[PDB]
């Protein structure tokens, strides 16, 4: 018994659940032994037969004969007695192995618990995407139903997702918080986040472990307001102690005044299971060693850490229904003075390359020891243009307001990086093929549009525009040349996925 | 000198003494091309354009535009021989439907060029006479609100492949995370992205020997050995269904016996290829090359978009549906506009498909102005600031953001969601084609689990 | 080997826990007598886990050493941790 | 080698392995995948 279909997200499943189509659940059966403990339940499933999904496909007698319940056998053979096996349809709470090819580590095949859902896809909770390397742009996964109590018990005790949280490969958790919940976590845990009475009570409806007691708000007067840290402390289990730094924590702050009482709230402290201070991000809820997720597994174990993942997602996704998140054209735009600084950097950088060329052409350039004059020239030019890329990129990152939605996703660590911001806003930069500047594929030139022996940045593939400004036609082609190399390399390394694993094993 | 075949070449404008030979009179003559006799051949014959191959290009200086011919403070080149006609002609067919492709990371343009080939539309106008084995036709294709000038020659207006959809880029309830998508169920009830699937079955009479032949006829249990629990009473006396019959899995569409060398006939009748309930659409009967009777049956089934179905936007942002919310539950603007699709913002920043964001902006200007927007690449006349300035004149925030209200509670959302019309594509891949119900690398993992009784139960 | 000179660790391994519960569950499903008052429990695998935590499972684990010798450990003799 | 069904694994287990043998005691190995226990006698 196995099944395959497309996977889709379901943030209302636990990390240890899988949502199974009702048609698949009807096609898959499990042989359950008849006993005086279950005979009444199994007789009902037999009376419902294969006709109504909560039913059964066969009765297997001690004789080994099977009364097939598909083709409506006579009621006088619907009798059950102890030791018969009823092939009931798969039901809520059955244990399955769930898998995605290529299988690369034992977390590619984990135990999940079935929840039957409407419609036709498999549903997984989004934290489990990271072990599987899964997403939902068309991926399919395999469900394997263990057929015996013995091998059911094996998977329960050895292979369930919560037991897989930490990998012996690197003594780290394999699951983080991801995507919306991670960008929401960061926003939710700023000092600024005050929650009204009605909002708090809504979020507490989702916290599954909550003991039913509303905490006294951080502010009582003039108006009762709870902080986001104050509700997140109710999510953190037990009495965990942890210290982390937020991704924007400044280097000097641990050494000057305000080592504690962090001005930017950039120092994370958890004590006695309570988040005292600090903005949480990937550094605290991600897969890295010593994250608050890691320490939860070490201190509290798998069963409690399963709940921790589930409560973070369900309450904070329901808070994002108030705060929202987006990205648009506004986030990709800088101020006029930022653009003038970016442009003045590029204007000088190009003139510096021309001065290198003027020395090389005039034979005023002396080679570096161990490098050829061509290597000496190309090294100097690549230094100038890579400095310009980094100088313009930091100038772009300085422009971004605290509202900017690129920065919100980078600083949370949920998606994107500082170079993506830099390329969208400031400069796409140098295009390379086989690690070199764009080759002279025509005789002594890169395209017919250039004159011969043009070593300047534009000729050799420096894209001085951003993705917002859009590429010029030559830049567009040279950016297609550099992008082809990355497509080839991906095709190569996707040919080797299991190669060394298969040979070593 | 090469007169050889198989040389790839392209037309280029001739430049002489830093001037085009193409003058205003040639454009005037080409403007009257429907009734004046002048054509492209006359442009070649006048020596105004020229074909050049990939190693005559070793000898040209190409102006990228006649801007390059103008006098300049520092002169790069004074010896141009030719000029590009339009730089966007470097693109091919499927890349020419991408708006603002100079604003995308180049791998995502490559992914659209493959995904465009999978977008439903109207594949050809005479599709009613074609008995193609599989075809997909969209109920309500639209031309893009935002279009490239090259899309004219692709005839994309006439056979479009997609619909302009109101897209919110929002983290809503989380069912659009990773690459998933939320769709408005009420739009789907109104026929948004609805399509029909056509499957055509051929069957043939044969004469295999002196006393064995296959003939179309209605089988019967009193004569045929091969009979099953399949259903034969949909067949007519000719052994064929008629169009307009509703069909399901293990319905027989073509009854065909073979006389055998209680029983006297074997049954070789053809069944509906899947359990998908469809309707017989056409049945044509003929003779083959051999003069034996020959049948084709076409079946249709309507495919309403489901949570499993895959969609894309022309910017390499493929995604399945994740859930469908009715209009009551969708977020809404003050004006009561709910989005048709909500995509996740996490799809954007690392992929850097900024052309997707510019399309939504230009499309909002286009739907308000009532004028289809020119998204041709390398156009110095269209810039994001100018699109924003035009959008402001219609009373929208200049960057396309909008105040949305939560559908469940009616509260304003604290962030202002980016919303605009975006041309979406329904892809061939549908969950109803794929829902179905353990190799070397799987055994290797079950050894590392130590699930030895599982590893032998599964083998 | 005798009860003395046991050199294997006194803890039950996870692999032993998995197979002991799996094997005892199938026994309980096959009407094997149950060594604890079931308070209306009916799933044989939850009864086996109940019997494990009570140290009531009537099973012995024969552990084989790489010399071919073996140690017999009663399930109640091992330190049970889950 | 007697096979005994788990229904008999009560106190009378050893008596039953005799009573069954007298109708048709070693270490009873539990067979993997089956409830039956195999006793050599």
């Amino acid at each position: 018994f196995s099944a395959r279909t497309v996977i889709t997200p379901d943030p209302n499943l636990s990390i240890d659940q899988v949502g199974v189509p009702r048609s698949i659940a009807a096609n898959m059966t499990f042989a359950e032994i008849v006993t005086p403990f279950n005979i009444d339940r199994l007789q009902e499933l037999v009376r419902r037969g294969n006709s109504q999904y909560p039913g059964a496909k066969y009765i297997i007698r001690d004789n080994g004969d099977r009364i097939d319940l598909r083709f409506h056998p006579k009621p006088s053979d619907l009798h059950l007695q102890t030791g018969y096996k009823v092939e009931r349809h798969m039901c809520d709470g059955d244990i399955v192995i769930f898998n995605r090819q290529p299988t690369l580590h034992k977390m590619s095949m984990m135990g999940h618990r079935v929840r039957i859902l409407p419609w036709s896809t498999f549903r997984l909770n989004l934290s489990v995407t990271t072990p599987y390397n899964a997403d939902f742009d068309g991926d399919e996964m395999n469900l394997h139903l263990p057929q015996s109590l013995e091998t059911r018990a094996e998977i329960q005790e050895l292979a369930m997702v919560p037991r897989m949280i930490v990998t012996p490969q690197s003594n780290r958790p394999v699951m983080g918080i991801v995507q919306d919940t991670l960008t929401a976590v960061r926003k939710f845990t700023k000092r600024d986040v005050f929650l009204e009475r009605g909002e708090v009570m809504n979020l507490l409806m989702f916290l599954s472990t909550w003991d039913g007691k509303v905490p006294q708000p951080a502010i009582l007067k003039p108006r009762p307001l709870w902080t986001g840290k104050q509700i997140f402390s109710l999510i953190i289990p037990g009495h965990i102690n942890c210290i982390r730094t937020h991704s924007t924590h400044p280097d000097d702050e641990d050494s000057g005044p305000y080592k504690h009482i962090s001005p930017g709230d950039t120092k994370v402290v958890v004590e006695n299971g309570e988040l005292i201070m600090g903005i949480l991000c990937k550094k605290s809820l991600g897969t890295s060693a010593g994250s608050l997720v890691h320490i939860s597994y070490l201190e509290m174990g798998h069963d409690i850490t399963r709940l921790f993942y589930s409560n973070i997602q369900t309450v904070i996704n329901n808070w994002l229904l108030i705060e929202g998140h987006t990205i648009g054209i506004g986030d990709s735009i800088a101020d006029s003075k930022t653009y003038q600084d970016i442009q003045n950097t590029i204007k000088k950088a190009k003139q510096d390359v021309i001065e290198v060329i003027e020395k090389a052409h005039n034979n005023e350039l002396e080679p570096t020891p161990g490098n050829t004059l061509r290597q000496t020239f190309e090294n100097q030019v690549n230094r100038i243009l890579n400095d310009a890329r980094d100088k313009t990129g930091s100038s772009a990152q300085k422009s971004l307001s605290e509202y900017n939605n690129f920065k919100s996703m980078v600083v949370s660590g949920a998606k994107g990086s500082k170079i993506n911001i830099s390329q969208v806003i400031a400069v796409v930069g140098q295009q390379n093929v086989e690690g070199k500047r764009i080759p002279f594929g025509f005789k002594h030139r890169t395209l017919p549009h250039f004159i011969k022996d043009d070593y300047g940045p534009e000729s050799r593939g420096f894209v001085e525009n951003s993705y917002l400004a859009g590429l010029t036609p030559t830049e567009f082609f040279f950016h297609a040349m550099g992008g082809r190399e990355g497509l080839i390399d991906t095709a190569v390394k996707t040919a080797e996925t299991g190669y060394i694993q298969r040979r070593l094993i | 000198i090469y007169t050889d075949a198989g040389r790839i070449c392209r037309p280029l404008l001739i430049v002489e003494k830093q001037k085009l030979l193409l003058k205003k009179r040639h454009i005037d003559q080409l403007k009257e091309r429907e009734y004046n006799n002048y054509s492209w051949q006359d442009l070649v014959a006048s020596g105004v354009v020229e074909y050049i191959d990939t190693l005559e290009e070793e000898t040209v200086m190409l102006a990228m535009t006649p801007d390059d011919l103008q006098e300049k403070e520092v002169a790069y080149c004074s010896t141009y021989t030719h000029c590009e006609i339009h730089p966007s002609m470097i693109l091919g067919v499927c890349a020419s439907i991408i708006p603002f492709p100079d604003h995308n990371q180049s791998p995502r343009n490559t992914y659209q060029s493959a995904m465009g080939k999978q977008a439903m539309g109207v594949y050809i106008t005479n599709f009613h006479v074609r008995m193609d084995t599989l075809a997909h036709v969209l109920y309500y294709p639209q031309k893009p609100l935002v279009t490239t000038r090259s899309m004219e020659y692709l005839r994309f207006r006439e056979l479009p492949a997609g619909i302009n959809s109101i897209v919110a880029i929002a983290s809503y309830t989380g069912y659009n995370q990773e690459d998933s998508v939320i769709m408005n169920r009420s739009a789907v009830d109104r026929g948004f992205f609805r399509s029909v699937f056509y499957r055509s079955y051929k069957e043939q009479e044969s004469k295999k020997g002196f006393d064995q032949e296959e003939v179309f006829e209605k089988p019967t249990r009193e004569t045929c050995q091969g009979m099953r629990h399949a259903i034969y009473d949909k067949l007519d006396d000719d052994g064929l269904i008629a169009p307009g019959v509703r069909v399901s899995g293990d319905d027989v569409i073509i009854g065909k016996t073979v006389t055998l060398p209680r029983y006297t006939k074997r049954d070789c009748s053809t069944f509906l290829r899947t359990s998908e309930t469809g309707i017989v659409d056409q049945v044509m009967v003929t003779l083959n090359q051999e003069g034996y009777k020959f049948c084709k049956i076409r079946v249709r089934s309507v495919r309403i978009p489901q949570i499993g179905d895959k969609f894309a936007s022309r910017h390499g942002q493929k995604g399945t549906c994740g859930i469908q919310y009715r209009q009551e539950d969708m977020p809404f603007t003050c004006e009561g506009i709910t989005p048709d699709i909500i995509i996740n913002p996490h799809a954007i920043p690392s992929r850097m498909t900024i052309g997707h964001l510019i399309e939504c902006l230009q499309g909002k200007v286009s739907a308000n102005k009532g004028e289809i927007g020119d998204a041709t690449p390398f156009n110095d006349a269209v810039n994001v600031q100018k699109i924003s300035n035009l959008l402001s004149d219609y009373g929208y925030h200049l960057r396309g953001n909008e105040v949305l209200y939560n559908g469940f509670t009616g509260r304003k959302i604290t962030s202002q969601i980016f919303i605009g019309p975006t041309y979406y594509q329904r892809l061939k891949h549908m969950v109803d084609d794929k829902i179905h119900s353990f190799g070397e690398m799987e055994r290797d993992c079950q050894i590392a689990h130590g699930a030895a009784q599982f590893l032998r139960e599964r083998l | 080997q005798a009860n003395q000179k046991r050199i294997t660790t006194p803890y039950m391994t996870k692999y032993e826990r998995a197979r002991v519960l799996g094997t005892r569950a199938l026994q309980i499903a096959m009407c094997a007598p149950v060594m604890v008052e079931l308070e209306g429990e009916t799933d044989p695998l939850l009864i086996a886990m109940k019997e494990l935590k009570a140290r009531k499972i009537p099973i012995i684990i024969r552990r084989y050493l790489p010399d071919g010798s073996y140690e017999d450990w009663g399930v109640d003799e091992l330190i049970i941790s889950d | 080698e007697i096979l005994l069904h788990p229904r008999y694994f009560g106190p009378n287990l050893l008596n039953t392995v005799k009573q069954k043998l007298f109708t048709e005691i070693g270490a009873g190995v539990i067979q993997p995948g089956r409830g039956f226990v195999l006793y050599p006698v």
Binding site: E154, L158 | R443, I447, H449, G450, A451, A452, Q453, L455, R456, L459 | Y15, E16, A18, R19, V20, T23, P33, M35, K56, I57, P58, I59, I60, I61, R62, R63, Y64, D72, G74, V75, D76 | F9, G10, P11, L13, L14, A27, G28, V29, I30, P32, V37
Partner: peptide, 30 residues
Amino acid sequence: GVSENIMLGQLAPAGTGCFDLLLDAEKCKY
């Protein structure tokens, strides 16, 4: 060997198969 037992469809000596279980007839009395 693991593969050798797999080729014969026997329990691999890996993991859950590296040991044997015996019925304790003495604990059955209660």
